[PDB]
Amino acid sequence: SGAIYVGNYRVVNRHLATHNDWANLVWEDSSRDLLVSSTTAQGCDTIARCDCQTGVYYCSSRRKHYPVSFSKPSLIFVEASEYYPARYQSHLMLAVGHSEPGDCGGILRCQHGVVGIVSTGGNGLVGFADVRDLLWLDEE
């Protein structure tokens, strides 16, 4: 589990979005596993605006933050998980590291702020849904 709180936006994995998120929907994309909902309260998270490929992510299943190198956001084939079939996922960054389904929502951060959230796992890789291209999260 986990979310990004930027301005009046809540960013979550689409597969973990609640009824309240859908009832306050701003934007969603299945291919990216992202959904954004509107919030009453101001969030303080800063979204990274950068092309960093090193950062730190939170792994709930190990109660640890791990420094990682990660690929640039790409269209990648993802094997079946407990929450998605085998399919292509877009805007996905991969690192070597641990990721269980419950780790989805863990933040990946670089010196510039929040890069993305854990979205995929398996075969000793962790995949992150990038948010750094969603420049509109910074405004409205």
Q: Which residues are catalytic?
A: 15, 33, 104
135 binds Zn ion (CB under 5 A): no
CB of 51 to Zn ion, least distance (A): 7
Report how far residue 102's alpha carbon sits from residue 22's, in angstroms, rounded to the nearest whole number: 21
Taking CB under 5 A as the binding criterion, the range among 30-38, 56-64, 88-96, 103-111 that sits at the site for Zn ion is: 103-111
Q: Is 44 annotated as a binding residue?
A: no
CB of 96 to Zn ion, least distance (A): 19
For residue 30, is it left (φ>0), alpha (ψ between -120 and 50) or beta? alpha
Closest to 35 (Cα-Cα) out of 23, 26, 46: 26
Contact 92, 108 (CB under 8 A): no
Residues 29-88 that bind Zn ion (CB under 5 A): 48, 50, 52
- Residue list, annotated binding site: 50, 52, 110, 112
